[PDB]
Write an enzyme that holds these catalytic residues in place. Structure first.
Site, short mmCIF file in Angstrom:
data_model
loop_
_atom_site.label_atom_id
_atom_site.label_comp_id
_atom_site.label_asym_id
_atom_site.label_seq_id
_atom_site.Cartn_x
_atom_site.Cartn_y
_atom_site.Cartn_z
N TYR D 155 2.65 9.11 -7.56
CA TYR D 155 2.62 7.79 -7.36
C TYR D 155 1.24 7.30 -7.56
CZ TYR D 155 4.21 3.48 -5.53
OH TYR D 155 4.57 2.21 -5.13
N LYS D 162 -0.68 -0.35 -3.93
CA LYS D 162 -0.20 -0.80 -2.95
C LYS D 162 -0.97 -0.77 -1.67
CE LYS D 162 4.12 -1.47 -5.01
NZ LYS D 162 4.48 -2.86 -5.07
#
Ligand SMILES: NC(=O)c1ccc[n+]([C@@H]2O[C@H](COP(=O)([O-])OP(=O)(O)OC[C@H]3O[C@@H](n4cnc5c(N)ncnc54)[C@H](O)[C@@H]3O)[C@@H](O)[C@H]2O)c1
Ligand SMILES: NC(=O)c1ccc[n+]([C@@H]2O[C@H](COP(=O)([O-])OP(=O)(O)OC[C@H]3O[C@@H](n4cnc5c(N)ncnc54)[C@H](O)[C@@H]3O)[C@@H](O)[C@H]2O)c1
Ligand SMILES: NC(=O)c1ccc[n+]([C@@H]2O[C@H](COP(=O)([O-])OP(=O)(O)OC[C@H]3O[C@@H](n4cnc5c(N)ncnc54)[C@H](O)[C@@H]3O)[C@@H](O)[C@H]2O)c1
Ligand SMILES: NC(=O)c1ccc[n+]([C@@H]2O[C@H](COP(=O)([O-])OP(=O)(O)OC[C@H]3O[C@@H](n4cnc5c(N)ncnc54)[C@H](O)[C@@H]3O)[C@@H](O)[C@H]2O)c1
Ligand SMILES: Oc1cc(Cl)ccc1Oc1ccc(Cl)cc1Cl
Ligand SMILES: Oc1cc(Cl)ccc1Oc1ccc(Cl)cc1Cl
Ligand SMILES: Oc1cc(Cl)ccc1Oc1ccc(Cl)cc1Cl
Ligand SMILES: Oc1cc(Cl)ccc1Oc1ccc(Cl)cc1Cl
Lengths: 256, 256, 256, 256
Positions: D155, D162
Site C-alpha cells: 500500500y 490516506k
C-alpha cells in the site's frame, strides 16, 4: 422504517431525558418492536414511560444479579422467538468514585462495582441473549464516553470502567461475529440526564463541549438515538467492534 | 548509571524469565537501589532470585489485599526516606478466562478478579506509595499488552483487564502529576515466561510476532527492562500517561 | 555513555533553542559521534553553534533538493564507514498555511510544500542513508506534534503534514526493519524555538499545555533530546514504528 | 427516504463496482438528488452508469486542477440553490508507488502526487463547495483505508496519503463546523474494484480480511454506501471528524 419488524431490547430507560429514551423514539419511528428493562423499584415509573412505544414486554433486570439477567431472557423468550438487538445504556459507580482526585477517591470495591455494572453487564447480556440472536444479522450497542480514552477530572473510575467496556465490546464483537451478531458502541457527548447530576464536573463538561466542539453545540438524545438505531440496522452489517462518537466533533480536536 | 541512587520497588519477580527480572537486571546495572515483593510461599524463591541485586528489602505483598499493600509501604518507609519508583509487573485472571470463545468463558467473578489484580492493584500501589513518592521526579510503570487495544483469540478477559489497566495508568498519571510523579506503561510483545503458560495460544502469538513484526524478531526481557528503566529516569520526566510498545514493531503493522 | 561510538547525523540544528540542540547535547553526553546538516545560508551560524559537539562533519542539506540529499551521504560516506542513526528534526510550511481557518487558508502548493519538506524528507533521508545503516541496530527518529492526531487552531496544514510524517515513520519502520533499522518519532509538546514564532497560536498553546498537562509544566529540549537519544540506543531495539509523547502528559488528558 | 430532497455530489464513479456506485445506489434509494463527476474521456461511460439515478448533472472534474474544481461548483450553482453534501471517493498514486518495499519505491514526485489527488483534493472540494453548503446541516464524506493507521505491504505511499487524508478530514471538520457542516470518513475493507487492480497484493488482502475479521466476511459496496448515506443524513448531525470502519470488524482485532 429501516428497523421494521426487528425485535429489540432496550435497557437503561429511566426518564424522558434518558439516552435510552432517544434510542426508543428513534427505533420506534423506524418500525422496531421494542421491549424494555427496569431496576427493581422504578417499575411503575418506567412502565408508564415506555407505554408510548407499544412495548412487547417490560421486565425487571438489575444487571448486578446473574439470576435476573438469566430470567430476563427466559421471559423475553416466552414473547419472542428470536432477538434482533440488545441496547445497553446503563452504567453505575458509587458517588465517591466520581469526585475529586482519582487516586484519593478510588477504592477497591467502587472500582469493582463500577466495572461489574458498567462493563461486565454488557458481556453478561451478550452471554444470555446470544441464543436468541444467533443467525439473523443481530446487533448489540453500548453507550460509552470519551472518559475511557482520555483521563479527565471527576469522571475517574467511571472513565476506567468505560475503557473496560469498550474493550469488552471489541472482545464481544470477536466472540459473536461467527453468529452474525455485530457489536458496537456509541461514544456520546455530555447530555443532561438523571445520571449526569452524579458527575461533579458536569455543568463544566457540558459548557466546554459546546465551546470547543467543531459544530459548536452539545448533542441531544435523538442524534445519539438515531445513531444507535442505524447501528442495529441491516445498513450497518459491515460495522462491528467500532466506537462511533456522537459528540458534535469533540473527540477530533485538541484545544479551543 | 542513569538510575544512580534511585530507590525502586519491583513487583512481579517470580523467575529467571520474569519480565520483572529483566527490569531488575537493567535498573541494577543503572545504579538503582531495589526492593522486591513476593506472594504466598515464594519468599525463598524470590530472595534467592534477587540476591545478586543486593535488595534493601524482600517483602510480602499479595495485591488482592489492601492491608498488605498498606503494610508494604510502612515497612518500606523503614528502610527508605522516600520512594523514587514503583514497577507494576503483575497480572492475574482465572484459567477459565483465558481459553476459548470470550463470551463462552466470561464470568462475573472471573471478570471481577482479573480487573482487581491486573488493574485495580496498580492504583492501589499508587494510593499507598504516593506519600513516599511526592516531589522527587518519582515514576510508576505498569506492564500491559496489545490485547488491551485489539481483541484477539484466547486473551479474552485479560485483554479487557489490560484495557482497564491502561486507563488506570492515564487517570493515575493525571492524579499524581501535581506531585511530580510520572505514570506510564510498557506494552511488551509476547515473551516466554511462567505466566505465558496460562495463555493457550501462546506459541502461536510468539511465532506470529516474529514473522509479522518489522524487526522480524521477538523481544526479550532486557529490551523491556531497559525501557522500563528509562521510564523511571530523569531523562523521561517529560513523559507520562504514555504506553510504549516494546514489541519489535508489531503494534504498527497490519498484515504479514 | 549509552551512545558511545555510535555515528549519528543530526538535522535541524539552527539555534541553541532548537530541539536539535537538546538532542545534540544529550547524544554528545552519551558518547555519540555527531555530524550536522544546515540549509544553504545558515552555514557559518550552524558551524559555530555545533563546534561544541566536536562534529565529524557539518554539511549542507536542503531537503527540498534530491541532489543535496544524495550528496549529503556521499560526503558523509567519505568520513564514516557506516551510520548508526538519522535524526530528523525539520519541518516547513509557508506562513499562510499556519494562520486562520484551515479551509480559508490551505492551498494546493502550500499543502504540497508542507508535505514535501516535513514528511517526504524523512523517507528521502531513509532512502539515501539506508546503505550506511544496514545491519548495525541503526535508528531513525523524527519530531512530530499532536497536531497530527487532533485538529487544532492555527497548526492547520502543518498538522496534516505531521500525520503524513507519522505514517511515513510507520511505513519506513516496516520497510527498513529487515535491515535492523528501527524507526520512531517523538511527539514534543510546545517549546519556544525559532520555528515556533511562525505559529499564530503559539503563546496560547504553550500556556495551555502547562495548565492542562498532568505534570503542570512545559517540556524542554533536554527532555526531548534525552528521549531521542534513548531511541537511538541499544536499549531501545525492541521499539519501532512508535510515537513517544514528550509533552508533560498533555496527550493523555481531555479538558483542564 | 432519509435523504429525501438532499442535493449530493458524488465523485469517483467509474464502474459498476466502484464504491461510488454503491454510495449512489444507497442515496438514490433514500431520496437524494444526485450529481456526478468524471475525469478524462469517461463522460459517456459515467453518464451511462449513472442514468438510472436521474442525475441533475454529470460534470467534468479532474481534481489535479483547481480551475476545474472551481468551475464544477459554478455549474452546480446553476442547477442547485445550495449543496447538502460532497462524497469524496477518489484517490491516485503512480503504480511504482504501490509495489515492493516502501523505501525502495518512494519518490518525491510520487509522494507529492499521491497526496495531491488523494488528500489535498478533499480540502479543495471543501474550499470551493463551502459557500453552497453553508448552514443547511451539510455533510462531507471521504473514503479511506486502514493503511492510513497501520503500515502494510504494498500500500506504501497510498497508505501515507490516506493518513494525510484522515487528518485533512479532521481539520476540515474543525474549519467547516461553524457552518453546520459535518465532515467524516468511511474506512472501507478491501472490495474488488477497478482501482484494486493497482494493488499488487489485493487478492491477498481480500482473502485475509474474510478469514480474520469477526464477521468472517468481506464487505460490499452497499454496506459502504449505506453507511456513507447515513453520514450525509440528519440522523448523523452529531458526528463529525469521525472515521467509521466498514470492514466486517477487521480494524478491531489482532491475530487470526
Ligand atoms: N449523559 C451523558 O452525558 C452520557 C455521555 C456518554 C455516555 N453515557 C452513557 O449512556 C448510558 C445512559 O445513561 P444516561 O446518561 O442516559 O443516564 P440515565 O440516568 O437516564 O440512565 C442510567 C441508567 O442506568 C441504569 N442502571 C444503573 N444501574 C443499573 C443496574 N444495576 N441494572 C440495570 N440498570 C441500571 C439506571 O436505571 C438508568 O436507567 C450510560 O451507560 C452512560 O454512562 C451518558
Ligand atoms: N510474558 C509476556 O508475553 C507479556 C507480554 C505483555 C505483558 N505482560 C505482563 O507483564 C507482567 C509480568 O508478567 P510475566 O509475563 O513476566 O510473567 P511472570 O509469571 O513471570 O510474572 C507474573 C507475576 O504476577 C504476579 N502475581 C500474580 N498474582 C499476583 C497477586 N495477586 N499479587 C501479587 N503478585 C501477583 C506473580 O507472582 C508473578 O511474579 C504482567 O502484567 C503481564 O500481563 C507479559
Ligand atoms: N517547537 C515546538 O514546540 C515543536 C513541537 C513539536 C514538534 N516540533 C518539530 O521539531 C522539529 C524541530 O523544530 P524546532 O521547533 O526545534 O524549530 P527550529 O526552528 O529550531 O528548527 C526548524 C529546522 O527545520 C529546518 N528546515 C526547514 N526547512 C528545511 C529544509 N528544507 N531542509 C533542511 N532543513 C530545514 C530549519 O533549518 C531548522 O533547523 C520540527 O520537525 C518541528 O515540527 C517542534
Ligand atoms: N476498493 C477498496 O478496497 C477500497 C478500500 C478502502 C478505501 N477505498 C477508497 O475508495 C475510493 C473509491 O475507490 P474504488 O476502490 O471504488 O475504486 P474505483 O477505481 O472505482 O474509483 C476510483 C476513482 O478515483 C477517481 N480518480 C482518480 N484520479 C482522479 C483524479 N485525478 N480526479 C478525479 N477523480 C480521480 C477515478 O475516476 C475513479 O472513479 C478511493 O478513495 C479508495 O482509495 C477503496
Ligand atoms: O457516563 C456518563 C458520562 C456523562 Cl458526561 C454523563 C453521564 C454519564 O452516565 C453516568 C455517570 C455516572 C453514573 Cl453513577 C451513572 C451513569 Cl449512567
Ligand atoms: O499479559 C500477558 C500476555 C502474554 Cl502474551 C503472556 C503473558 C501475560 O501475562 C499473564 C497472562 C495470564 C495470566 Cl493469568 C497472568 C499473567 Cl502475568
Ligand atoms: O511543529 C511545530 C509545533 C510547535 Cl507547537 C512549534 C513549532 C513547530 O515547528 C515548526 C512550525 C512551523 C514551521 Cl514553518 C516549521 C517548524 Cl520546524
Ligand atoms: O485505497 C484503496 C485500498 C484498497 Cl484495499 C483497494 C483500492 C484502493 O483504492 C485505490 C488504490 C490505488 C490507487 Cl492508485 C487508486 C485507488 Cl482509488
Amino acid at each position: 422504517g429501516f428497523l421494521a419488524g426487528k425485535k429489540i431490547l432496550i435497557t437503561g430507560l429511566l426518564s424522558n431525558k434518558s439516552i435510552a429514551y432517544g434510542i426508543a423514539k428513534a427505533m420506534h419511528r423506524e418500525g422496531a418492536e421494542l421491549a424494555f428493562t427496569y431496576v427493581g423499584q422504578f417499575k411503575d415509573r418506567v412502565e408508564k414511560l415506555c407505554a408510548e412505544f407499544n412495548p412487547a414486554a417490560v421486565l425487571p433486570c438489575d444487571v448486578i444479579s446473574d439470576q435476573e439477567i438469566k430470567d430476563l431472557f427466559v421471559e423475553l423468550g416466552k414473547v419472542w422467538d428470536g432477538l434482533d438487538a440488545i441496547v445497553h445504556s446503563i452504567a453505575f459507580a458509587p458517588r465517591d468514585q466520581l469526585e475529586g482526585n482519582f487516586i484519593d477517591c478510588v477504592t477497591r470495591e467502587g472500582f469493582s462495582i463500577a466495572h461489574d455494572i458498567s462493563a461486565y453487564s454488557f458481556a453478561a447480556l451478550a452471554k444470555e441473549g446470544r441464543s436468541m440472536m444467533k443467525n439473523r444479522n443481530a446487533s448489540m450497542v453500548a453507550l460509552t464516553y470519551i472518559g475511557a480514552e482520555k483521563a479527565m477530572p471527576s469522571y475517574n473510575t467511571m472513565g476506567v470502567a468505560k475503557a473496560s467496556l469498550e474493550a469488552t465490546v471489541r472482545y464481544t464483537a470477536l466472540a459473536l461475529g461467527e453468529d452474525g451478531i455485530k457489536v458496537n458502541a456509541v461514544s456520546a457527548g455530555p447530555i443532561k440526564t438523571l445520571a449526569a447530576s452524579g458527575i461533579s464536573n458536569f455543568k463544566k463538561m457540558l459548557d466546554y463541549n459546546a465551546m470547543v466542539s467543531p459544530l459548536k453545540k452539545n448533542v441531544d438524545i435523538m442524534e445519539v438515538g438515531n445513531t444507535v438505531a442505524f447501528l442495529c440496522s441491516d445498513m450497518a452489517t459491515g460495522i462491528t467492534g467500532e466506537v462511533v462518537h456522537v459528540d458534535a466533533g469533540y473527540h477530533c480536536v485538541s484545544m479551543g
